[PDB]
Amino acid sequence: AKKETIDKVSDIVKEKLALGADVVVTADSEFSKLGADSLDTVEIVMNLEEEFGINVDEDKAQDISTIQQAADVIEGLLEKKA
């Protein structure tokens, strides 16, 4: 995944709780980590799919790894965006 995409995705997560000011951003920073799976993925997938303006499915945005894999995924969806 291109750094441009990695930085973008990592941003969508920060906006969730207003971050990116005094916090360190990493592509390995697993966004999904909850023993109860309380985290709202629908909100995340929507942000990325919206900003990037792509067409991703929940099944494709449910088992996505850290930002590393996330960025790579969106990349392919940005190739044809169909």
From Swiss-Prot:
Signal peptide: none annotated. It is found in: Plastid, Chloroplast. The modification O-(pantetheine 4'-phosphoryl)serine is found at residue 38. GO terms for molecular function: acyl carrier activity; phosphopantetheine binding. Transmembrane segments: none annotated. Keywords: Chloroplast, Fatty acid biosynthesis, Fatty acid metabolism, Lipid biosynthesis, Lipid metabolism, Phosphopantetheine, Phosphoprotein, Plastid, Transit peptide. The keyword Glycoprotein does not apply. Pathway: Lipid metabolism; fatty acid biosynthesis. Residues 3-78 form the Carrier domain. 4'-phosphopantetheine is transferred from CoA to a specific serine of apo-ACP by acpS. This modification is essential for activity because fatty acids are bound in thioester linkage to the sulfhydryl of the prosthetic group. One of its GO terms (cellular component) is chloroplast. Belongs to the acyl carrier protein (ACP) family. Carrier of the growing fatty acid chain in fatty acid biosynthesis. This is Acyl carrier protein 1, chloroplastic. It comes from Spinacia oleracea. The gene is ACL1.1.
